[PDB]
């Protein structure tokens, strides 16, 4: 839309408006396969740990193999969800499957909180982050920028909670919240998997939550869930801000994950599932084969709403 | 439920559509502090008086 | 894809550029052309007398404005018509014009203005 | 941002144990109606007056952005600008310093008639080729006491 | 495989016209509140403050 | 059209040429390829170890029989995959090969037979 230009009355000239613009895109999705086998030579003669003279059975070995496979798939699913939240869906190996910013023709937004500077305007950065979602949502409805998830790492959280502005402001308060934040447990709310109660901090209309999630791949390199690809100082804190579920409403949900069938027979042209597990027997009683499949892709239809957060200055 | 890309004899899914409506502001016009004064002529006058 | 994104394309221009046109029983502002060689016509392109698109320097030879979407591979228009039609006489179109490389609009606008074609401001 | 950051206001408000003081500092702010794109607009209370943060912009035909809250001639990013105009209750309904006039469109049967906000005209094309539309507006808003339209700046004189 | 209809196109065109006029009115109201009335094309030669003296 | 006919092409070959293959947990007879730029792959075309098609004079360099339909400028197969997969190890296939022009069929089949691929006499 644009503003009308004034025209004179007698010279009956007017203005017109440009038409709409409609395009189309498509999405490929990743396939995961895992194979494990049970051989009697790993059961015969072997001793069950924790037992004096009892031997392992096929049942316990099968149960532990299946549990490990399911845990691996869940962990990979969590890593992929975090990668999609980052705006770029990069496989653990490093191959690109869906660059949401290039596909939807939008640019990534990052905010430098400048936590090291004692004179930094934390309110200004929070307001900028709040207003960016409302400005760039472009859903046609009314947006509330206060309804976002801000997930930070250990260093960013420590730098934020120890800033002289925040601490001096919360010290001159006689509210239970300030007492809890200053002299009290900063661990309301959680289960991060390992923690019973994750760190979170209330400053304005938003909350800052510290997430310590990290995984490793077969190459041994660690994969921090709250990180920026490229930036690896130790003295800088990184964060990720994404819209809350109840910001654009249930009518406009921007976080989706797809599932499509495995290429086994029977399953052609069917609705995809979370995971397929198949039982196969080796011939001549040589053991059992296991296969696990998953054909999925997490994506965001409005990648502009995924805003990155840093602790240093631009 | 639709033709695929680059082939006519295979199929694909549409799975909806996204929209990008522009941003319109209505704060000042919503204040309602401007009073409508419809008139017939193309030019209206006004005389200013101020006692010293 | 290997590049991270895949784009199937954009919708071709629609026949909404015409605002006013002299409506006559057989059509007054519309003339038909014989499609030349392997050429891709779209709505809003300026054509020459022979039917090929205007180029740099040939601006004075602006004959009409294409109002159909033609396909070289099919040798048919998007309405399943054998020929390509343009607007060359008294009409009032929009500013949407598909110009080639290195061709200025001002020379094209004046050339079409002589034939009686007017362009209204269109904006966004 | 510069107003809420100022040390004098911050220190005057840090030493007050009131819900308002807890709200203006280390609080959500964002207490107001919608402007068109956000649910609430920032509002700060100090000294009996209210500072309301309005950030509205439009574009013309030639991609130029027109910020609603701006002062012509100054484009510095560091400086801040604002506008203050009398409220409806300040003068009462007997001096609305604000008016908008409307005049008729130049069509037959509309001459010397009270103009309205919008003139919508629908015309059928010839033969059977489609529909034509026209929209008209002949208006001008004005203020009879412009001396009360004070603009504020965040820099020194 | 659903075709567009005349009603949808007409409704969207009319709605765009109305919102264009609404945003132009909002811009003009802002201009009047600022002190001088200038259109989007920026027809500006003198202040209205000075002619209200 | 202007030629009297408007043929819209023929359906691409389907992946039904595999009659028997070594079914293995990790694809005994399946080998991945990195697609070559601006190259179309179809079910049946013979590929070298580099990934390009077997041209005339290099029939002995046949490596695998492609079983995916790649779409070049799409850089995605017809199943949305990222790489081209061809059968190279022990398998039994139908006598449906899309060899390039000037390529000896007997030399290619003999080269593939050494790898373990056999072709079953088809009919028409």
Author numbering:
A (entry chain A): 54 to 367
B (entry chain B): 2 to 53
C (entry chain M), F (entry chain K): 2 to 125
D (entry chain B): 211 to 367
E (entry chain B): 106 to 158
Direct quotes from the study:
Here, we report multiple high-resolution structures of the full Sf14 particle, including symmetric and asymmetric reconstructions of the virion capsid, empty capsid, portal region, tail, and baseplate. Sf14 virions have a spherical icosahedral capsid of 820 Å in diameter, which is connected to a long, contractile tail that is approximately 1205 Å long and an average of 235 Å in diameter, expanding to 315 Å at the baseplate.
In addition to the virion capsid, we determined the structure of spontaneous empty capsids, which have a mixture of non-attached or attached tails, the latter of which are contracted or non-contracted, but contain no genome. These particles are prevalent in typical Sf14 preparations and were hypothesized to be destabilized capsids lacking at least one decoration protein. However, these proteins are still present in the empty capsids and the etiology of these particles remains elusive. We hypothesized that the large proportion of empty capsids could be due to a loss of one or both decoration proteins. However, after resolving a separate structure based on empty particles alone, we did not see observable differences in the capsid composition or conformation. Results shown here are consistent with this hypothesis, as even degraded capsids without genome still contain both decoration proteins.
